[PDB]
Design an enzyme around this catalytic site. Sequence first.
Site, short mmCIF file in Angstrom:
data_model
loop_
_atom_site.label_atom_id
_atom_site.label_comp_id
_atom_site.label_asym_id
_atom_site.label_seq_id
_atom_site.Cartn_x
_atom_site.Cartn_y
_atom_site.Cartn_z
N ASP A 159 0.79 -1.22 0.00
CA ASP A 159 0.00 0.00 0.00
C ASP A 159 0.83 1.28 0.00
O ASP A 159 0.23 2.36 -0.07
CB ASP A 159 -0.95 0.03 1.21
N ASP B 58 2.40 2.77 2.40
CA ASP B 58 2.08 3.60 3.55
C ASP B 58 3.01 3.28 4.71
O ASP B 58 2.57 3.12 5.85
CB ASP B 58 0.61 3.41 3.96
N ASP C 74 5.45 0.63 4.24
CA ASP C 74 5.64 -0.81 4.14
C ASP C 74 7.12 -1.14 4.09
O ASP C 74 7.79 -0.86 3.09
CB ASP C 74 4.93 -1.36 2.90
N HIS D 280 -23.49 -5.18 5.96
CA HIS D 280 -24.65 -5.25 5.06
C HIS D 280 -25.35 -6.60 5.13
O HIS D 280 -25.78 -7.16 4.12
CB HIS D 280 -24.28 -4.90 3.62
#
Lengths: 196, 84, 392, 242, 686, 210, 194
Positions: free
Chosen positions: E40, E42, E44, E653
Amino acid sequence: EANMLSDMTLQGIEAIGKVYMHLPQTDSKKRIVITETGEFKAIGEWLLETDGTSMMKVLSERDVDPIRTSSNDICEIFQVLGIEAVRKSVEKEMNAVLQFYGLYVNYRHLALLCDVMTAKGHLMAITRHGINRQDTGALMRCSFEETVDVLMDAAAHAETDPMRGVSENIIMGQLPKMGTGCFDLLLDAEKCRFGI
Amino acid sequence: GGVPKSKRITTKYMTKYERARVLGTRALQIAMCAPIMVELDGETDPLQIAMKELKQKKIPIIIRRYLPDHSYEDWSIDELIMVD
Amino acid sequence: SKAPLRQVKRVQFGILSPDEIRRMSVTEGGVQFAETMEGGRPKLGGLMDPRQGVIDRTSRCQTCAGNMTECPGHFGHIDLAKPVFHIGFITKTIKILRCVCFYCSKMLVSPHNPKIKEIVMKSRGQPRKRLAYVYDLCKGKTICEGGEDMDLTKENQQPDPNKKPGHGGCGHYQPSIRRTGLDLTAEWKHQNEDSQEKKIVVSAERVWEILKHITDEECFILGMDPKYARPDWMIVTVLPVPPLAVRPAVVMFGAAKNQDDLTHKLSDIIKANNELRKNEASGAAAHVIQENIKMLQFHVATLVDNDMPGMPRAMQKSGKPLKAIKARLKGKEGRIRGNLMGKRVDFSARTVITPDPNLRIDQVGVPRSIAQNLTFPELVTPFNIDRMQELV
Amino acid sequence: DKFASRHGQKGTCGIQYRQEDMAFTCEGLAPDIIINPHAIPSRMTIGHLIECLQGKLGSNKGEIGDATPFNDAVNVQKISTFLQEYGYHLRGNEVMYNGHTGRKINAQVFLGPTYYQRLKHMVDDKIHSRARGPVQILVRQPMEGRARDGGLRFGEMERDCQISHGAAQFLRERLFEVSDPYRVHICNFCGLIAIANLRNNTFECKGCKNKTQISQVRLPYAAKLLFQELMSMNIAPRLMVT
Amino acid sequence: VIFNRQPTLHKMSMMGHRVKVLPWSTFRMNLSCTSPYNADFDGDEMNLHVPQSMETRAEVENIHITPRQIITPQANKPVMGIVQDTLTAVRKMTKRDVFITREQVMNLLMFLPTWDAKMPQPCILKPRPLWTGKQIFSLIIPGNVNMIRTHSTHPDEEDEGPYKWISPGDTKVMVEHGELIMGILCKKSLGTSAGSLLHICFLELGHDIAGRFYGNIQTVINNWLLFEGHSIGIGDTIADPQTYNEIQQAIKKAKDDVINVIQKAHNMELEPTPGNTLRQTFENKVNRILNDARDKTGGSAKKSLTEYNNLKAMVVSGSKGSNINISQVIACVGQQNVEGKRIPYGFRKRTLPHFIKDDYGPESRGFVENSYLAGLTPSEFYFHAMGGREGLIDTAVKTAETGYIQRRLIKAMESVMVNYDGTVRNSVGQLIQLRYGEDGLCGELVEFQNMPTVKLSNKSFEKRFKFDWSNERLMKKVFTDDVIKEMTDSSEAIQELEAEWDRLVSDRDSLRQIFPNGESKVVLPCNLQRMIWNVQKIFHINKRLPTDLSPIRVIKGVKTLLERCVIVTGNDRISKQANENATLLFQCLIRSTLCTKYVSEEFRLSTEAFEWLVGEIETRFQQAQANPGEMVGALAAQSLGEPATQMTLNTFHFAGVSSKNVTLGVPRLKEIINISKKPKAPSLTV
Amino acid sequence: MDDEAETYKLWRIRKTIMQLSHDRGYLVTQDELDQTLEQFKEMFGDKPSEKRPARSDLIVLVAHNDDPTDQMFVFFPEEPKIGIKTIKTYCTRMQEENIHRAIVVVQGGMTPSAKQSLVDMAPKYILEQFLESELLINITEHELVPEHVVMTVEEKQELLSRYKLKENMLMRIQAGDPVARYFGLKRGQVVKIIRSSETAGRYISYRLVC
Amino acid sequence: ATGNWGDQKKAHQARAGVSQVLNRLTFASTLSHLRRVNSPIGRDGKLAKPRQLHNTLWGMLCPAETPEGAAVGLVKNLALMAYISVGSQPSPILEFLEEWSMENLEEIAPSAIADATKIFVNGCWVGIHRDPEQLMATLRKLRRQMDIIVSEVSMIRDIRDREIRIYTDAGRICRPLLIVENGSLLLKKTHVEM
RNA sequence: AAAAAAAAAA
Ligand SMILES: [Zn+2]
Ligand SMILES: [Zn+2]
Ligand SMILES: [Zn+2]
């Protein structure tokens, strides 16, 4: 009075709890037949969903289909149907779990697992009671779980580990008989032709 | 357990697990200054020489394929056919 | 090294016999002293024996004359005055003890039984399942039934000179065996002869004498090979001493001030053995010898397994439990999972990743300091002799 | 270097660009920082856009913006109406230009001041490389941590995926060649560790009385410690070589 | 070098890479590595390893390299794909209105290193030379690529209409002869899905050509994105005021409906459905009303968005987002659910002290009537905190047992080995399978095949597959005179066609016996339609001109194909029985598709096209076999443990339509792993 | 109520037994396979209380096609618990007719002493036992059960010679499996399983009875 | 210094992590570390029920501040308005109760308890009273007028179960809130000017 | 130089 209020059964099966009646809306629990024109027709017949599995008292009823009715309890399928039906039921349950989330796995990876499940003729588990009870080597079984117990069992029983696995050769450090290491390369003396 | 050549039941097509180890072993042999069977076109990385002499199937490596019943079949490089 | 480098083919496990333990050990006469340092020099027969291995980076081995990288370490032995139980083998030992006789040390079911033969041909090459089937067959046996003249039910029957031998039953009831840790108790639900009482405690010496007098043929049907795994070798009579490679000398500042836990545990073992052999030679009371045997068995068990429930935990100097060999092997961070399964690599790097769109997928951008630190060991060829020459 | 927003928009600096090589507005405004729009809807940060719009409004007007939650006095339409009066687009969009070529961007872009926070996870405190270094006094394995100059952990799932690839030589390299190689001398009859003096080139088994039938086996050091520990547990892992 | 991110959940999470030296102190790689590595960017931390022996470097080149590991054997799909703004600009660049000048395509030209320096003639020649997006994406696609898919915004009524081959919306995506012709690309065509452009360019061209095609896409697309640009803003989150009024009126109508439902439940007018109690019936009615209102408002919000809204174009690009994200942006958030249920009464008959006791209205229930753009009330913000804590809890809790299950599965099948005889054995040599996957083929080179001889009627089978020579008008317009003279010189052709028809009838009967539910989709290698299309395009097959291919040569070629496509070798009866047992579906598909009517009236194949086709089929069936020397057990364990980390996405959901006790997710596989000693939810379907 | 249900379950059990005999290669006619409930009521009776039919009345003797002197008896005892007395009665009937195969269908239970009796009379006469609840459902007719074929020793030798297989490294099936009890498989036999495969059409495997 | 909350020799039975090194990275990090609440449940439980953010944490603890990983839902941070009860002696409330109208347990018949309302002080049953509404109004007046009962003391009138619970112990957490009677606030513009 | 504890990132 407490005995006839809390213990006896008027009708049904004591091992079966809540029972629901429904019609399937998809073409999975319907009866698929072949018409006279050669087409496939799905008939939405009424069917039962019972909580609690005892099909010695369900399939032996008056008007219960003996063919299409199955169960999610693998051990009861083993003591009722057989080990290949266990393989098929485990494959069907895995397919149902994977298709509930929409995830698709190839049939060969599932079939390899399901044929591993039925290797010894009975239900072996992927635990410390099914892997460590195999006929494999000592370093197959100690390197997963219960290392000291497997090692002392091999020491007490004088168990011979023939060095055929991969983690065995990983522990003892040479090239395993695995993947690209499952063969040997020999130098051809006659093929040494003109070079430089 | 020497299997005769007419008795070999293994495949005649060399897969990539054999290809990687034969290429590495032959390029290592060239890296210890072995004679090169084919003509050189200025290549200096011996792995590239290993491919371009694997194309004409002139590599002296005998593959000893091991059957599960502890028997072995010997297959030469030129007996196997390149596929990729 | 002018030794043939060959590939080993299989691993044969077994139990080290005390004669073999005495034969492996380079410590002649056994390890007698718990003191590691004796006047600035290593002491022979101690825990810092030069024959077992090396001491520091400048010393050499007394046996193989090597450094740390050359000496693999050589084992020692301690001759215990009285045998003690191996705690981990205890769960095996009762499996023999409930299958062999308590008095004549014979088998509860005679080995020419057709059920025994069916188990033997059924479980060829599977000794653990063979022992399981033997224990399942012998779970219901409570009497050592036997005797060649116990089948005289016929009248005017001529004796047969071609008759096979019958079972040997000393006519004694096998006691139920109970355990609450390391102590072993035997109870007779049916009373034997009046010289034997109903509740007894069984030490390691009685079990050692019972398992000593078992023939190899009865060990074969027991699924336990007499060549390497005789049942009397599970009881610790001669304790092996690991070398200095297994127990390293932890250096603090200049000199090694403190040792590891294994050296202190072996010092406790040596002190326990010396106290026991001093008390038995002095003709002391029976309760003193019983206490010495109990504490020696406690030190032996805590050397083997400190994680046994219902067994008092070994007390270390820093408020921790002792780390036994089972704690060294079993575990995620153990010698198997953390040191053999998952040992660390040398040539590796790790940093934070950032995107690079113009690079193709089969390429990685490498920093200059990482590429300088990490090296590729290229061979020297005549094709690129000048380039490697300018590189060096 | 790890940067973050006040709305959970964490990330790292992919590249640096000078002012002459990146986008500029019609007013010559080169932004300090550029981000990915695709990180916006997945993280579901509309409050970042409201913060950007209120920052542009408060920087054009000259007021400190109020971002108090559950406040009916602050609305997106009110901020848009107040921002429309200052000669800018009511949604805060601006027309910028290419840095390399100077062409107008076909899609109008959203610009404004926000509040970004730097994070302590710098790459200078996390970069590590190692060729050869110290080994342990027990298992002769690399260290732990960057301060002790330790190597990477070739864990279980590395062996799992390499077995899945089925390349044995990389496994033999990473788990025997570059971790802890060792050579031991083994008696053929007993299968245990034998005495080997390399100076006078003598070999002797103390139990088998064996002087000639001694072989050499290469092995990991941790396997040797496992075998010695088992030899301490009255277990004989007899490794015959014939 | 070896490039690996931890944790490694599967086979594709460590690649081999080529070192390029860059000054800065980070790792630099292509964006398409983010999908197999699950990275990602971020923070890593990620590892690199250097081989210290060059034969291991040769093993890295021949096995561990990235383009040789494009297709997963887990689900026969690619694992890298075109993502993020590269995919968004692919979607925005293939549009019909994109008219691009000579200078801009000139700029885009040098970022194609595989280009042959032959520029195309422009689509527009006068008065100004203009290209288009499909013409310049045609240069990126190499070789012979032919492809049919549809866009994610393709209407279903367009396919049966008269505009099915000429789309006003430019939705159906057509590729012919390796050049892009028709349609806008998206996640369906240039993603990780099966049957994509990436999958067929791997399967038809090779590993290196497809891997170069991956890098050839992204540079050109990112350089075109400098000209175009893409940007989301706060104006994309605001819809029409009429749409906002309609959404608010629909939400108010749903609130009035659920108030009326509560009133009729309090007035003893709610009849309980069978299979559940009155509590579950009332909760299911309320949840269905709120979910239907949320979906209707989301559809009304999505429909009212213009084509200039970059959020809608980004969602229909398929790189990120979905329709529920658009609904939460514009219309409303919905009902907050804890464990798929109502927000529990933490207080005495109250979720919060700010409500009233015994209140079941949607304000106290957890339904959010406002969007995130409009802002939340503090009570529904607290209910959103209730909902959002459960996702982090479900992420944190199950991943211990997931990793334990993965380690147990990888330890149990660590030595399940395919040997040189084609059999499958474990470490002890016990036979598990005679062939891997019961067909002796690898999972990478297989794909999805539509089976034409299952679903159709008997009269369609007679009019569609039975070759009749009596219709002399079709016979004259289809065949040349040389074929007529050739078959009239022979006499065995009529009974040969009758035997072919009997074999088709027997194969249809066997396929109906194998598949009782009429499944016409199978998993088989060597997609026949794609290579028949390829040999049509290569040899320039005219479908309105008579051909010179006799049906007897077609039957001889099919028989030679089925004789030369063997898996189980040997002249023994067991060997032959295993040979036709392993290749039964392949024989059925070959006889069903290479029939005498398809190649003569439908596809109109020639003779040299037919021999190239049978050579290609034989070669591709040879290379699709399972390789002797391949580990399959650890591969199967990783390919089953990888979806075990991805069955937490469907937690929210959920309302439940049936009140049946069933165990779903981690526990289910956990039990099947313990041989399901005791079913967690024992049920019978009778 | 009891009579009609007893007649129905007796007809179902007899049909299952006849299908089991047909699946074992024995001489089985088509009308006994297709015997309806009304046909069973006409042939044997409909009131099992007043011995029409009796439990000993329904006794089935079937012969083998290839070897006519190899026959099977089927016994229906009336008592729920089976002692050694009725086992010995069946045995004393069993030697005097010179046949080596019979199956006794127990109702409620069958004692462990008689279990040991059936164990140690096994290698002269084969006397299998079956529960009445297990014989109300045909095992091989289920959709989860594939085709099982008993295989001779010559084809077993051909299978071992072709694939270079040994018997210990084969796939296994327990002797207590209901499929193996349905076919009467003994230890050492190899059964061939033919199943439907979604990737190859059909698949054939081989299992060793243990 | 170590953090083990107990004896040095028996620190294995003591809790770890009670004393932590203060995070001096920002002012906000220091303020978050000074207002941290730790759950005693260990970070290995598969049960999700203690990890669920409860509905009773409105204004007591921060709803959107938990660390990530296996410690989510256990480590939390205090709310901005929340105040921890220091603890007070429950004596003068008890003397005021027994002098006002309350009837002690040792001076009443056991058959006259069902009609009245019990009084619990720090979980201790003291007696019963037959007018709980007027007593609770008097208790609210005495707590608001700051005369005898401090504002820290919590008190519950279980109307449906006829109980009065008085809690003066430490460990309680409170929020200061405005007082509303007759649909109007007690805060006026005079208080704003003050 | 070991071990324990705490804080974090993915
Ligand atoms: Zn030495
Ligand atoms: Zn005896
Ligand atoms: Zn020796």
